[model samples]
Target: CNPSACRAVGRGLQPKGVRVKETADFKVYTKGAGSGELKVTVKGPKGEERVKQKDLGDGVYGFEYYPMVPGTYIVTITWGGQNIGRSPFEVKVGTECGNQKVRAWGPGLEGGVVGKSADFVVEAIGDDVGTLGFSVEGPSQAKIECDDKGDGSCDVRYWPQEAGEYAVHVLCNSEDIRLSPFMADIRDAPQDFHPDRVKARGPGLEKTGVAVNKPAEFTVDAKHGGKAPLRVQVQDNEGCPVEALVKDNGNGTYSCSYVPRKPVKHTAMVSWGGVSIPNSPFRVNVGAG
Candidate 1:
């Protein structure tokens, strides 16, 4: 094996593009001229040395080096105590930051409500912390604010003006964090004291009416009414009270049921927060069985 005929080649031999705290690998090809002892040395920016070399069958050798900080690294590869090609390679290592190492959490990343603040946290926890970039895009442009804790972590908050789905993008050092562009489902705030938006529908409210002594069911949706109370009343033709039951479905809908004893016309009144809902005093007919 001739020392002058052996050389090292690979992308890791480039003079630029290496990053700190990242592993850079390269290979030493002997060109089948003959196998010889290969030696590699990596000098870091702070005068630190790091390099790992392994022999593969067939005159091929593998080498790896790690950069501890952002700076230039000098890599020298030798075969049989002789320099190969330029012998020493200058590799520039920069602080690109680790995208996989960045993390985010909190309720804001999941969803939000109109006119309400949604919050989340970012932790750039690692040896190479980078800058953070956050944005929120949706039906309405939302202003995002960040509070840096000065400890490799920061808090972020945004207020949505409209109800819709929002796209949240979080980046570190110009690279996206884990699961960037998070989708947030934003909904309208329940209109407090505004019963006009409250809606009700069902077969029970239809003019066809219900059968005598039969159970009639209807539904009420107060989700847009904003924290309003729902009230239901049933009355016979004589203006006397009748039995009616209203059940809350929890998600802003209600289940109302009533039974008519007489096969005559009846009245069903529905209100929101003491105010009558749309088409209140619904006149219902009781059909004979």
Candidate 2:
């Protein structure tokens, strides 16, 4: 069994997203025997820079980088000859002149349908990242026009009449960021339509009431709409997080199990593509009764 919990995990068992501005900072906690010498290197559109590590004491360490240009920057961190976390972690940095960084994600880059319209949002997440060149293309690679909100964001409502993939390619300082060809699949505009949802499907759900420190479970169907991935997080009434694990059932459904520690109200938050699906943040009264 993996003990360090692996890197790139949401702590909930999914790939987590990062928000990097002109510069970003990250830390590592003591693991294995002790916090040995840690090494970090950042590689981006502008080549590579070896990040400096700082000992924050008590098994905690720090590393940081200030990047030039907006693109996908890869970070490699190693501790005592072992890869730290998801070594070569991806850090998407946006610049202040910031055409480069797409700071926090706007909307999902998911699949769409022909003749059906959806709303999308994108933002500049860098220092001075401007609002000059944002673009969207359809399955045929033809440009689709969506209204620009004129803030540092590009807002658009698109209706596709064909089924296939669409690409969102934006420019920062006239340079293509790391995820230049961000793609989404568009199903043929349908004869039937549906939204995304999830269910506890068992007694582990707070809706069914569960004991604190006891295991709970859920049935997730988040991909019904978009090409989405599942992410689960559990928290006590105090909002502090706990451990969770997800197992895909081979079918379209999934199973998630979590154990609550605090003998208070608890919540299970399920997310798809950075946003919550319907009926999420399932709250339950943690008890001994």
Candidate 3:
């Protein structure tokens, strides 16, 4: 694969942590283009350091860090002056959950789709009597229990059958997690084909970092799905429509290209038969890539 082809395959952002008991090394699987420099910053209650970078090629890069002290730290990375690949990565050096000791997350945890499996997560901090506990209720008013992961976290993989918003109720120990009944949006399943079968590809749509105002391209192969001659719809991080050039491939494929006008994150939505297939809300970060 070419350098551009591996943009989305980069990995090793890693198990979140605050300190490296011994020596901490940051590793990123970035190949090509943005190979010039890599930096990691760790800021915590104890102290902070801007990590150094070294490229271990064949598409992999890394930074070494030695951490001490118990605390919470914030880590961010930049490539070619682009804030890509991380969401203010928070590392757990050593800490306590305190009074508000519950947190939740999932794929659709933020956004969800009907007929798609979404795994919701919950973590209990502070002092939880036993394994974390919780239940989920959806638009249909059905309730299901969450499975505890032995640690302080628990998860429930659920397939929503309806379209709309859902309520995730939580119970950490005996009290409700601060944001009990977390709200989530769920849309109807795809209309053009089996959501599971549709393939959405593009550097801009695959969460790859792309340059601002550059024509970001993506392809949709939603065979037997959606309306014919489908068009891809786009919106920015703040949920504003973005103009793009789209083509109906006639052979069950679509090509889309858009020049990101702002330096921010964006999502692209493609629909058919009135509904969107899985992964319709494709995401990408726009910066100086």
Candidate 4:
């Protein structure tokens, strides 16, 4: 077993009055006998400090800190009391009414097929003066880091030996700010897949039996189950299939449209990745104008 180090980010709201209290939490990942403990300390801008030390049971520990004044503060977490990890943050204490509170939250992949990395995005929204930072716990085998300024994106790459749940911590400003648990379902792909609904509409097809030679256009619709993107394919009985990328409308609906080359028996098939929808085989007919 090897000993590894990581950081967690936290967010605090600036409260009113001279005295303010804000708490942030963090978690540690460890394995084997020599994994060791975690030490946390908070220091105010004028050199005021509050230190709390705890032993991590089975490679996990949580720290909570409250600052006394409004200013920049330094947070330090040490592994085995020898290795030093530092993160800097700020606290705003005032009586202002319109002062916005800055906080962080995000989600990522946790347990899944080995060697697959989880994509996560962390954000700092509200009234703040500076940017946010992020880091995660793991060895060189698993690299976790974030872009503080550029799109506020964070990612983690890891490969576990077996299938199980994994822990991931998000550190904002060097403290444990958010904890997100993810699961990877690794198994044989499903056989039957079907779209929630399929819709077809055209100007000429609805009125007359004659096929419109000008152009025949149709759309395929599929619903994503809060997962990744969906792939849609439309094919004519005579020629090759035409592929169109589905765009998420951000309202639980997706659609793609394409003009047919020639009027024939056309079918639309929708699948997510390799998961084929068994019930999806929509047909469209194009006639001579």
Candidate 5:
């Protein structure tokens, strides 16, 4: 058997960092020695050995193993009953729980509003207190603050500057908790309105022949002007105010109506946020029967 012509390759064959309970696999090419015995073995950190092998066709053999402990593992591959080049590979499996066992929970991990402060709590229970911290990633820069109570609990506060998806990660000694990274949606705050962005329209505002002793109605649309209260009134030339009625359409528009008792010119006044909307004080001429 020509063992020198055999080679092994794949992520499972390279020396790298892996987590315990994860599967690692690799392939051994034996084209040089088509008629030879191939064997694979993995030695755990506790000196326990696992022997396994499989033929994957095309002169290739496959081997896979699930790491059982958190430490160094030795993977040895042999061809034709002989040792091949780089026969033994080392892989480091990191501990699932570092020095401290961490548990994180709070409403802040659920969701929050932009420009508001969000918070969560983390408790680490173990003998050793290694490096404990958290990281935030999102659309904008966040103000991160952590207060360790010196006990086993830590208060983590963060202010999201913008609206989007924010990822919060809790880690102890560079090892993440089972649910370390929590996804939260940062929503924008309620919008504010401006008087200039409000508008009024309809026949009652600018009609030339409005009937007297009848209800003259108009509409005010302030969807873009934001969320604010609207005020509307109707008065005659003598400054005598008429009984005007305003109804909110539940949307951003309002329906206003007032009875014109006298056949005289009336002024329809509309305001939002205590400021007159665009083209306010519309003139209407009432006609007598």
Candidate 6:
């Protein structure tokens, strides 16, 4: 989206002239379709001595001038060689200090619980953007920490008790750039749980000692836990139960086999012990050969 577009306008310069004697930077926008180049030039007061000239890329340009005697300097930016604009800047060319740029981000996470792990990512971009960190502080009792080297992104996860509003501070190089205070609504509910793994296999006809040509030769083996026994039944679309041996393994498992009088599609139902589960109906195709 265009939300990320840089839209800061240049300032402190006249319509067509500006002065610069030290380091200078320029910002340009390319929109989404237009493209243009930037040409920068620095000249002495008399405009006789050319100090520097550079052709920066199509977007932004930056140039630093060496230490020179105190004097007036003229800086010019020309796009497409039409002399778009210029500014007159003065530089003392003396010892002074500059600060690093700082930016912050936060409040991008929602829908988390106490005593449960929730994660959020934060980003910081600037010079000396080193050793980013984060922390959470509030009435809730929980441990909070962040991962710095994982993906150059701030990842914070924690659990909270006695849920309410909480304040979260994200820092970069010990500087608090983003603060995201959130409200956590804790509810009394059952713990979420699920089986680690589940496996189902085709009928174990081998143990039934039934040959392929047997009048009723089909079987299915269903094994599962965390549940109860299942009723088992096999019938064709014609509302007739196939003649075959059906057995329950008695260990939350079942087995059923049938060889219909004629080849056709059959459906099997497994229900018992207050549980009802159905096996995928199978088709038995027959040929004249």
TM-score to true structure, per model: 0.34, 0.36, 0.36, 0.31, 0.34, 0.28
- Compared with the true structure, model 1 gives a TM-score of 0.34
CA lDDT of each prediction against the hidden true structure: 0.70, 0.54, 0.56, 0.41, 0.69, 0.39
Cand. 5 Cα-lDDT: 0.69
Candidate 5 stretches with Cα past 4 Å from truth are 1-100, 191-289
lDDT of 3 by residue, 1-289 (tens): 2233222111112222223353454455555554455445656566666566676777666665555565555666656555544435665543322366566544444445676655554545434445455555544753454565554545465666876555555555555444444555566644544555667787877656688878898887877554433536666644356898888787878788999888876656665432345665455678876
Per-prediction tally of clashes: 2, 26, 9, 15, 1, 19
RMSD of 5: 23.9
- Return the lDDT, model 2, position 160: 53
Residue-by-residue lDDT tens digits, candidate 4, 121-203: 33334334253433332322345544443322222334433333344444334333422222222222233333233333333
Candidate scoring better on lDDT of 2 and 3? 3
The root-mean-square deviation over C-alpha atoms between each candidate and the true structure, in angstroms, is 24.1, 15.1, 19.7, 15.7, 23.9, 25.4
Over 4 Å off, model 4: 1-20, 32-35, 46-48, 51-57, 84-289
Weakest 10 consecutive residues of candidate 4 by summed lDDT: 10-19
Give me the displacement of residue 31 in model 5, in angstroms: 54
Worst 10 residues of 6 by lDDT: 8-17
Residue 9 local lDDT, model 2: 17
In model 5, which residue pairs have backbone atoms overlapping below 3 Å? 193-225
RMSD of 3: 19.7
CA-RMSD of model 2: 15.1
Worst 10 residues of 2 by lDDT: 8-17
